Amino acid sequence: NAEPVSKLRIRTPSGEFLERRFLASNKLQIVFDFVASKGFPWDEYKLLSTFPRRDVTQLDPNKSLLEVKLFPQETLFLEAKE
């Protein structure tokens, strides 16, 4: 019934917030591009999902959001690959 849209607040390394409205059919690559389209990236940034405390809700920039289900409201953190 209806698609699960994920609204996330992604904090940056400077104390910024990337508010993002996600269409459950969107793609992590879009999430990554949207935030790096805001004030980042440095070349290739990775977000950290706080709720599950994991590499950007399951990771996989080529995965869709339903596969990584960013819930309806989730907070992520901006981080640099390591």
Side-chain angles (χ1 to χ4, degrees), residues 4-9 20 22 69-74:
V5 203
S6 300
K7 196 203 164 124
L8 332 177
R9 304 216 179 59
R20 202 51 268 290
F22 285 118
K69 60 276 144 191
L70 333 197
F71 244 37
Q73 309 197 15
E74 293 198 320

Side-chain angles (χ1 to χ4, degrees), residues 28-79:
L28 228 49
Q29 159 181 119
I30 218 199
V31 199
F32 306 172
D33 240 282
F34 120 66
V35 272
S37 175
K38 240 54 238 295
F40 340 99
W42 97 257
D43 250 32
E44 310 185 315
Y45 268 154
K46 247 113 296 188
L47 304 144
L48 164 278
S49 21
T50 73
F51 257 55
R53 217 165 239 196
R54 70 188 301 140
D55 201 304
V56 77
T57 148
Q58 239 205 351
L59 255 173
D60 318 349
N62 55 301
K63 267 199 178 182
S64 90
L65 281 186
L66 266 358
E67 349 298 275
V68 296
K69 60 276 144 191
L70 333 197
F71 244 37
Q73 309 197 15
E74 293 198 320
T75 309
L76 251 144
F77 272 121
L78 220 131
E79 248 151 67

